[PDB]
């Protein structure tokens, strides 16, 4: 894979550490440009980290913290753009990678051989009692010319004194004791006021649009682009989607035009991303923009005619920006809502809260608000749910959890600590992006019965699961799917919970035969749904009772025939 999405967990103890290694692999393996923040936290000594090998670029910040690991192999990493920064100021953060209390553990050598560039932000290296050479580096050289206010705060306390760097290095400047870890300079050595260079001479100066240095003066030859890679060439802006006429200023669509996606000019946006009016590939539309689905591809954003007719916002958006959970003080905002622009979080607060005081608990019946809901643009998180409810049937008609905002930057569907006995998400047929985490739900069966592969939309995605009721003991009680669930796939017991109903449907229920020849109301079939006839159509003996729904389309009228209808 070319690109991957990063995270935003940021020093939080991961709620199931047994998963945590699997998540990092699924997310960062194969990938070369980490869009988001590269967060390697709470990693054990042994941890196989070979999946981080190919990382060349980090859009955001790099956080290596609370790790017992001997070394992290980010050797190919050439640039961090610092799109956001840890603790407001730090593009790189190496914190608390020791043993507190083979022989020792903790971070020994940094090994950032290639890390030539840090556009925005500073560096923070503290409390790493086996970390060496942190001292030696000329950090000033690594920061870009523009930010260079870019402060550093390096702590140098150790429990071993270190080797010197291999004498091959010019000054004592290295990422490790090996000769191949000498910190070759780029910025602070060049001729004139060069952005960056491959050597101290004028021919050795890089193009204005190169970033992490270069292998020659051309705009092709950059180790990374400052602004955008345009089909092999570094440029300041992508070719716009629309040319304008000399006189009229009409939209003459650019044959060679591209969209901005990260640091790349792109012919069309990736799967879950929204095409923008301006021509970007965003995950949330701009101000004065409306989310629209067109007949041409995915959803796109648009400059509105009227101050865009408001559509039901969720958490992490507009007036619920910094609310952590759906509670009894905002449950009735979601009434009647077909689609929620944002996310939903259910916490132990929401059901057992009275903290801040006076705010009443949510009742199980108040949750039926969401029965209308078909789509969530963001994530679903549930760390708490009432005991009385055995499932998440409230979200029965939830179909698409897109996850353009993901929990801790990773998890779209998060279910933890619940005591629900089956899932119930019977309409759920897509997980747009992000990982699914279902864990420590003591009672939950019907997890090994959902074909999660069919929900996912890119190879990074996966389900992670532990400490739920195991399917050996579920099937031990004899809890299979219902007969009529094709390929035995279901979200719970009974005939309502199939993913594909193998025969015929009656609203919720999967069914062998409709009531076309015998039964209570007589029924016409349409797209495998048993829909009743008009009630005033006559019941027939050994025959079809109607063409369709209405009274004009009966075989015979039961009481009065007055065309065009029966009555």
């Amino acid at each position, epitope marked *: 894979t070319q690109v991957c999405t990063g995270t935003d967990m940021k020093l939080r103890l991961p709620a199931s550490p047994e998963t945590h290694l699997d998540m990092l692999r699924h997310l960062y393996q194969g990938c070369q440009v980490v869009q988001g923040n590269l967060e390697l936290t709470y990693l054990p000594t042994n941890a196989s980290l070979s999946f981080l090998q190919d990382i060349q670029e980090v859009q955001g910040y790099v956080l290596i913290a609370h790790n017992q690991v001997r070394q992290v192999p980010l050797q190919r990493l050439r640039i961090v753009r610092g799109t956001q920064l840890f603790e407001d100021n730090y593009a790189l953060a190496v914190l608390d990678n020791g043993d507190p209390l083979a022989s020792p553990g903790g971070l020994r050598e940094l090994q950032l051989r290639s890390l030539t560039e840090i556009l925005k932000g500073g560096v923070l290296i503290q409390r790493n009692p086996q970390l060496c050479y942190q001292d030696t580096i000329l950090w000033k050289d690594i920061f870009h010319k523009n930010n260079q206010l870019a402060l550093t705060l390096i702590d140098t306390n150790r429990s071993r004194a270190c080797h010197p760097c291999s004498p091959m290095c*010019k*000054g004592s400047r290295c990422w490790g004791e090996s000769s191949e870890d000498c910190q070759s300079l780029t910025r602070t*050595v*060049c*001729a*004139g*006021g*060069c*952005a960056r260079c491959k*050597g*101290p*001479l*004028p*021919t*050795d*100066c890089c193009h*204005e649009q190169c970033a992490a240095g270069c292998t020659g003066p051309k705009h092709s030859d950059c180790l990374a682009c400052l602004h955008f890679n345009h089909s092999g060439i570094c440029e300041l802006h992508c070719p716009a989607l629309v040319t304008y006429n000399t006189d009229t200023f009409e939209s003459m669509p650019n044959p060679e035009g591209r969209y901005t996606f990260g640091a790349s000019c792109v012919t069309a946006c990736p799967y879950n991303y929204l095409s923008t009016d301006v021509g970007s590939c965003t995950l949330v539309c701009p101000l004065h923009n409306q989310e629209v689905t067109a007949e041409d591809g995915t959803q796109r954003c648009e400059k509105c005619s009227k101050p865009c007719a408001r559509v039901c916002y969720g958490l992490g958006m507009e007036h619920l920006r910094e609310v952590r959970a759906v509670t009894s003080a905002n449950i009735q905002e979601f009434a009647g809502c077909k689609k929620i622009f944002g996310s939903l979080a259910f916490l132990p607060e929401s059901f057992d809260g009275d903290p801040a005081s006076n705010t009443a608990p949510l009742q199980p019946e108040q949750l039926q608000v969401f029965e209308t809901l078909e789509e969530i643009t963001g994530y679903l998180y549930i760390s708490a749910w009432p005991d009385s409810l055995p499932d998440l049937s409230v979200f029965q008609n939830l179909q698409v959890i897109r996850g353009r905002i993901l929990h801790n930057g990773a998890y779209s569907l998060t279910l933890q600590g619940l005591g629900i006995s089956w899932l119930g998400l019977r309409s759920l047929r897509e997980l747009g992006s992000g990982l699914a985490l279902i864990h420590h739900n003591t009672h939950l069966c019907f997890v090994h019965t959902v074909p999660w592969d069919q929900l996912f939309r890119n190879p990074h995605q996966a389900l992670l699961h532990t400490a739920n009721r195991p399917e050996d003991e579920c099937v031990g009680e004899g809890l299979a799917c219902h007969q009529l669930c094709a390929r035995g796939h279901c979200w719970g017991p009974g005939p309502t919970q199939c993913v594909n109903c193998s025969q015929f449907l009656r609203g919720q229920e999967c069914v062998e035969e409709c009531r076309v020849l015998q039964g209570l109301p007589r029924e016409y079939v349409n797209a495998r749904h048993c829909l009743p006839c008009h009630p005033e159509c006559q019941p027939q003996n050994g025959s079809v009772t109607c063409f369709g729904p209405e009274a004009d389309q009966c075989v015979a009228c039961a009481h009065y025939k007055d065309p065009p209808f029966c009555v």
Partner: antibody
Amino acid sequence: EVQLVESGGGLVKPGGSLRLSCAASGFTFSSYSMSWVRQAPGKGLEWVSSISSSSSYIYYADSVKGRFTISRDNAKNSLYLQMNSLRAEDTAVYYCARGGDAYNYYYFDYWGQGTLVTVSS
Amino acid sequence: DIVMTQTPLSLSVTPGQPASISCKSSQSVFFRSNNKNILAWYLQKPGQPPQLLIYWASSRESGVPDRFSGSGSGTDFTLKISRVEAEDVGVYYCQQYFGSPFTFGPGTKVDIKR
């Protein structure tokens, strides 16, 4: 004032060796980018080699590469040149010249008197 | 290899008359980063080593009098001497310090017309 006095020139049989040594005075030698320019008798000027202030950057011409080795001792205000596998072609004056500002611009602003090196059996 | 061309090889002029020497380079010597051409000019007076006349293709060194002035840009340059004096006798060289290998031109021999 500025002064570069070079030594160790003279006669060498083809294939043999010789070591030039240029002694600097009247500036902080640690902050300047030294070089050797040679001149065969009644010919133009040929760049031989260059070395940066701290010795962290070295270069050679293709005609001399491998055969010649440049070096310096900043503590002892001196610049050296180890010419091995010498040839008739290498016969020339060898001017020791100081550059401009450490390792960026090779102006050559002050030149030595130069030492004559002859290669004949 | 930035190959250096000088023309002419001989110049013979009466002192007081002005005189000029063109330098050409196979690849450009203009540096965008500091907006200067990275050429240098020297006078090798006979029975002496070379002396630096000009750096940055147009800026003089300390000691070098008014008459000596470099000009041009890109690949094509011209060293000028307004009012040649009888001691200016020598050979004039152009060097580039744009990149390895650092190359000189052939030289231009200036004769005083006595």
